[PDB]
Amino acid sequence: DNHLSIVTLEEAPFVIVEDIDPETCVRNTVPCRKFVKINNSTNEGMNVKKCCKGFCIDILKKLSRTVKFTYDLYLVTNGKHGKKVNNVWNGMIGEVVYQRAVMAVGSLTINEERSEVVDFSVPFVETGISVMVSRGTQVTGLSDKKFQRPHDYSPPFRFGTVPNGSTERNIRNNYPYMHQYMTKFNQKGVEDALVSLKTGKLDAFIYDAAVLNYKAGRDEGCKLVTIGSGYIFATTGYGIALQKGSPWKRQIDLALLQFVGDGEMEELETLWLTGIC
Amino acid sequence: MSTRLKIVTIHQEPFVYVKPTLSDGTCKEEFTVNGDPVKKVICTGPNDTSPGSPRHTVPQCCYGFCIDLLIKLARTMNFTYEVHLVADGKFGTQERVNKKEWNGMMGELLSGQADMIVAPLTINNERAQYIEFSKPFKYQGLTILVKKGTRITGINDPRLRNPSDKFIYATVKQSSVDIYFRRQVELSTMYRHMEKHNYESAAEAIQAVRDNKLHAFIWDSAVLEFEASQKCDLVTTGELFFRSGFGIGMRKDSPWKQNVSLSILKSHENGFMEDLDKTWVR
Ligand SMILES: CCN(Cc1cc(=O)n2nc(C)sc2n1)c1ccccc1
Ligand SMILES: N[C@@H](CCC(=O)O)C(=O)O
Ligand SMILES: [Ca+2]
Predict the structure, then answer these.
(1) Given an 8 Å threshold on Cβ–Cβ distance, is B265 in contact with A235?
(2) Could you tell me where the beta strands, DSSP code E, fall in B163-229?
(3) Contact indicator for B169, B197 with CB cutoff of 8 Å
(4) Burial level of A3, CB count in 10 A (0-12/13-18/19+)?
(5) What residue of B is the nearest CA neighbor of A167?
(6) At a CB cut-off of 8 Å and minimum separation 6, what does B109 contact?
(7) What is the DSSP letter of A85?
(8) A1-127+235-273 falls under which CATH superfamily?
(9) E strand residue ranges, A135-277
(10) Which domains are assigned to chain B?
């Protein structure tokens, strides 16, 4: 029973999805399926054969080899990372919770509320909340009065996040006024947020630290930066989510700490995460 | 009748400060610059640090980042405790006797002398094979402490990779740093030099860098950077290698294990851990 159903989600450079070759998956890519609906009047769909690569995919490749398992990799279609809606989890967390996946592999933030319903492996990447601004924007960080009490300013500071993930949940729990203010600046995704910042439609973009630090590292003309020296609030990490009491957790944790010890994680960081800026 | 948790810790500034009690057995009332009272605990431990010598247990005062973390953990989970300092003064390694044994806080936890390790204890594969580690409370790495004026590039400096009796560099015996230099074959030539000069404690090694006796100390950046910020005559050189985290140590069958990690996650998410970092480390 070592052929495992594994859920993932696209988020460059952690997980990168490509169309199949002219007619299987080649190079450093692995096969990954995505259930695609026929129309919106039906539940009928078809799994499209795609190809996955990235930092988290190389981790899956190493774990599969060390921990000795094979897997069926799929991309989540019901939500994204994981949100608890009326006590029902969607996204990658939901897939693990409702046992459609043995594990979730991706840019998945370890937090307390997710940890109540899934077990997480040791963190493989450090993350948290970083703030991206145009170089020179004067903000101390999350605690800045520009974020805490935005209407104390004329015109007020414009900032938002991509909702439904661990960044929004944390801002909701810690800064109630800031949160209710931000919702009008909610971004559909990271790409829109970066464009909004560059087109002067947003002053700050609050998001996952590991993704923001990678985006700042690759920005054209190194214009967009993360405040502080790439500072991280509510520091956490990305971990593999497994079902509570999973028999795989012990071997996955030991393998990950083995990889860190052997400088293999530092190598993957060099190959996927380091930028020009 | 006690159901009190036996907590094992080690002397390691700024995570754990160890000071004598007053003539009456209480702790000197102290305050932060804010005017906030420094929380202190009675920690029993040996007054004779000397190796292969009798250990006379005396009540001492303990405080710091790790003690503040213990108090918060005990408050959240509703447990009682008693703290003692590791009898042999070590973090913990597995050494061959045919059989293999864990020493330090590791040995104490496995033998039942402790129910929980609350200290700057490095999470690694070797220890994770025998104990449960919580989610990390601190992420840091290894750096090098030298006297102000000693010019070194870092872990790839010719004075380290090509060892000689002229330049003496070391670490702490029976520590995770020792485990790291032993495991990695690419660092065997460095380990071979270090095994000859490794100290019993971080304090002794830091003091030997002050006394021109030890040229370079390889240790945890959270400790070394703190030491460099206080003792202006000492500086940390190079950037960070073997990035590693600190976690709480428990036995694999501990009933508190799930609730310890949730409390650590809660403390990172609500700014409490960053506040501890501000009070004690920065
Ligand atoms: C202390 C903050 N961290 C970040 C962290 C710690 C750590 O040991 N490692 N090991 C790696 C390899 S990446 C990494 N990131 C954290 C806190 C709670 C939950 C997860 C992470
Ligand atoms: N990695 C985050 C998603 C992005 C964010 O909300 O910052 C999570 O797992 O929820
Ligand atoms: Ca117990």
Answers:
(1) no
(2) 169-170, 216-220
(3) yes
(4) exposed
(5) B269
(6) B8, B115, B116, B117, B131, B249, B250, B251
(7) E
(8) Periplasmic binding protein-like II (3.40.190.10)
(9) 159-160, 204-208, 224-226, 233-238, 241-242
(10) 1-139+248-282 (3.40.190.10), 140-247 (3.40.190.10)
Q: Which CATH class is domain A128-234?
A: alpha beta
Assess contact for B102 and B62: CB atoms under 8 A.
no
Q: Resolution of the coordinates in A?
A: 2.2
Phi, psi of B160 (to 5 degrees): -105, -50
Residue with tokens 């370890």: A110
Query: Same topology for domains A1-127+235-273 and A128-234, yes or no?
Result: yes
Helices H, strands E: what count in chain B? 10, 13
In the PDB record, what is the listed experimental method? X-ray
What span, in angstroms and rounded, lies between the C-alpha atoms of B162 and B234? Answer: 24
The Cα A37–Cα A45 span in angstroms is 4
Q: Which ligand is nearest to the CA of A258?
A: 1
Does the Cβ of A236 fall within 6 Å of ligand 1? yes
d(CA B169, CA B193): 8
The domain spans of chain A are 1-127+235-273, 128-234
Token output for B215:
């040229």
* Chain A residues within 8 Å of chain B (Cβ atoms): 110-112, 115-116, 120, 122-123, 126, 128, 170, 173-174, 233-237, 253-254, 257-258, 260-263, 266
Neighbours of B187 (CB within 10 A): 18
Beta bridge partners of B245: B139
In Å, what is the CA distance from A107 to each residue of A80, A210, A211, B2, B259? 10, 9, 8, 44, 24
Question: Under an 8 A CB cutoff, do A112 and B269 touch?
Answer: yes
| CB hemisphere CA count around B65 (13 angstroms) | 28
The SS3 of residue A175 is coil
Cα–Cα distance for residue pair B35/B29, rounded to 1 Å = 12
Amino acid at residue number A262:
D
Q: Chain B residues with CB inside 8 Å of A167's CB?
A: none
Angle between helices B176-183 and B188-197 (to 10 degrees): 140
**Atom 16 (ligand 1) nearest CA:** A236
ω before A155 within 30° of 0 (cis)?
A: yes
Spell out the residues 6+ positions from residue B79 whose beta carbon is closer than 8 angstroms to its own.
B5, B73, B256
B267 annotated to a ligand binding site: no
Q: A218 is written with which tokens?
A: 């690759």
Angle at which helix A264-272 crosses helix A55-67, to 10 degrees, equals: 150
| Contact (CB, 8 A) for A277 and A214 | no
